[PDB]
Design a protein around this nucleic acid. Sequence first.
RNA 1: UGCU
DNA 2: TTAGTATATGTGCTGCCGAAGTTAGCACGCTTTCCACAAGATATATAAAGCCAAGAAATCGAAATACTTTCAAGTTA
DNA 3: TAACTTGAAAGTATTTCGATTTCTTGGCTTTATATATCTTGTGGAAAGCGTGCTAACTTCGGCAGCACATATACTAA
Lengths: 111, 180, 98
Amino acid sequence: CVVEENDPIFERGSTTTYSSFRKNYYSKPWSNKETDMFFLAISMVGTDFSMIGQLFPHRARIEIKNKFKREEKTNGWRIDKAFQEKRPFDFDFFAHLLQKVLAEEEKRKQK
Amino acid sequence: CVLITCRQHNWPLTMGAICTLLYADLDVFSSTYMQIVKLLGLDVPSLCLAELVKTYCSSFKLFQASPSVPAKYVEDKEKMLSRTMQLVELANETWLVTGRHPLPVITAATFLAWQSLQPADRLSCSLARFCKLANVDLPYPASSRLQELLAVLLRMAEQLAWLRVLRLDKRSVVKHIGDL
Amino acid sequence: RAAQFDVVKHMRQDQITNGMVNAISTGNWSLKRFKMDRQGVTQVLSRLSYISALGMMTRISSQFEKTRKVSGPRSLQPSQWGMLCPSDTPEGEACGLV
RNA sequence: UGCU
DNA sequence: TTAGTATATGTGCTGCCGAAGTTAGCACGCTTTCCACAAGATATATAAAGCCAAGAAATCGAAATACTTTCAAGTTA
DNA sequence: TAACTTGAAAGTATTTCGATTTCTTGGCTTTATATATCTTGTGGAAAGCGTGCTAACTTCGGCAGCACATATACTAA
Ligand SMILES: Nc1nc2c(ncn2[C@@H]2O[C@H](COP(=O)(O)OP(=O)(O)OP(=O)(O)O)[C@@H](O)[C@H]2O)c(=O)[nH]1
């Protein structure tokens, strides 16, 4: 038996209710240094979103795809320069930069 | 099918309540609605504004004095409904309901009417407070619709002579909304 | 489905309404839980006159309902003193039962 | 349900 | 071999409750699976606006002090 | 018999402060066209309790059973 485990809710007016149409997505915005390192990751990998999402643990692959589409629609010259420039794939230094970004967002939250 | 049958007879019924009682989500609901209407091609009469206004005004409990709501908030039904109808007609003629959801505008109109019927005791009441008192789910864009309707009312005040001299604002034009 | 079911979506609001409407209009009451099958419970109010209506409002039907010409319940019993009108009775086949 |  | 006795022989009696049929004259009036075919769920502009929730700035509300008023009792006269 | 310098006594005013509102962000919804493929969303056809009252007359009207009696064939003297 439920021993006062839940509380009654005074919701769902029998009169009527409306729609929402927006439930879950609720993305989170980027920053300047984050956009810089994102362009770096683009120049380093390409357009394959699987690897980008794997290397970005704290940002979603859908958000990454939305950002890439927004960049393709607004700033084309930047994407062109990114594809022009190339960098060999780095793993240890990339994890170090990930830790640096974690520390930076921690400092931001502190601020 | 229920919605089309309800529309064919000029009967107001909100798709929100339909989805609530149908165990479905608005996204898939609208998708399948568009698919079926494109596949059938049946007449889809537009949702009349006055009928929905009356249906939503009948929901509010500011007509009979209940234990929770004091007598000060209780107002007349016929006069408040007429005021809400005039306000929503003004909104429809001023390009406020076109392209936007109608129910937020209806809520803003009935709130402005309830405040204008007695501006004194309700100058401090807010939209969220009114929604809590009436036991109605507060629409999100209702605030923006209210802010736009109040701007339109301020423009009407500026057009009028005595009000433009009084130099009212979005908080003091509620007492003259009736004259507008 | 995983969607939790609640009664509000099947709470029939017309069942009781139609039941009461039919029971009052048709006049036939069929209660299966009690095995009661009665007829002629409700009758059209006779608006022939105010006296007619006032007299029909205070009528009494019997459980017999013209089953046999027993003459027993149809006869006027001394037990009706001060309770029912001895002289007021419809003239015809329903003499003594109404 | 009333009427004879 | 014949009188006394047991049985079944159909017969005839009794109740047995029920069986059909009766009651007069008008005007009103759900489950398993099994099954197969086509429909989720998927990239992708794409212009467009409205919506629904974090943040940042703004101003309203008002509370704890700083001025002035006001008495009322007391001073120089 | 007044007049001015007292005191703690109000409003009364303004200045900042809690808080809620308003203003910004994305991002998804939707419009069409087709391009293409996995398992799992279904269509559809099968098939392996429980009462009450009698509504009462008439005159069946049979059979149930039963059951009583006895005529006869078997058996003891
Ligand atoms: N006006 C009127 N009402 C009736 C008539 N017959 C029946 N009623 C109504 O029905 C009730 C009694 O009628 P009944 O005799 O039970 O109906 P019935 O038994 O079917 O009569 P039959 O149709 O002759 O069998 C009365 O109390 C009335 O309520 C009728 O012939 N005329």
